[PDB]
Amino acid sequence: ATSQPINFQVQKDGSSEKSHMDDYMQHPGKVIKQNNKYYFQTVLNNASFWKEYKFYNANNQELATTVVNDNKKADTRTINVAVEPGYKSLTTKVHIVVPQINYNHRYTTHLEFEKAIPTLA
Ligand code: HEM
């Protein structure tokens, strides 16, 4: 396995402004290459709030996500999002539910990588 840190910023639909969703993901992220796949690995803060999350490439096909750890006490979740070299921008569609404030909303954002996903060894 080969891995390296990658900077990213979740941005509002239709804007380069920082999205509220960015505030619920740890920075930096990670790109991992393994047998023969690439993953953007990221940590969701307050994972209990993320009722649904889907990711898409710029050409609008859904990217497979997997759960690498689920940490119930810290309320975090580490996930892998299948990516390819060259990917610059992911579209995300999320369903966020915060029961204690009667909050139930759905959103679209775009997750912007600082540099395109690199080719790795
Ligand atoms: C108790 C926790 C939270 C509170 C109090 C809260 C509050 C808000 C508020 C006030 C807005 C403004 C809506 C608008 O201007 O139309 C908003 C929108 C939004 N929220 Fe949250 N939110 C919370 C949790 C989350 C979580 C966990 C996520 C996902 C990681 C999230 C992602 C978004 C997104 C994507 C928008 C639409 C505009 C944007 O991209 O920033 N929020 N929320």
- Ligand 1 binding pocket mutation candidate from 96, 98, 110 (most atoms within 8 A of CB): 96
- Method of determination is X-ray
For the residues of 24-55, what is the DSSP string, one character each? GB-SSEEEEEETTEEEEEEEEETGGGEEEEEE
Total residue length of the chain: 121
Q: 23 in helix, strand or coil?
A: helix
Q: How far is CA 27 from CA 24, 62, 113, 115, 121, in A?
A: 10, 23, 11, 14, 24
Contact 8, 27 (CB under 8 A): yes
- Residue 70: CA count within 13 A, CB half-sphere: 5
Cα distance between residue 16 and residue 36, in whole Å: 32
- Cα 8–96–45 angle (5° rounding)? 45
> Residue 15, annotated ligand binder?
no
Nearest Cα residue to atom 26 of ligand 1: 21
Domains of the chain: 1-121 (2.60.40.1850)
Cα distance between residue 10 and residue 57, in whole Å: 14
> Residue 3, annotated ligand binder?
no
CA 93, distance to chain mean position in Å, is 10
For 44, the token pair is 């969701």
Would you give the end-to-end CA distance of the chain in angstroms?
9
Contact 34, 40 (CB under 8 A): no
For 7, the token pair is 């900077």
Cα distance between residue 5 and residue 91, in whole Å: 20
Tell me how crowded residue 51 is: count the other CB atoms within 10 A of its CB: 13
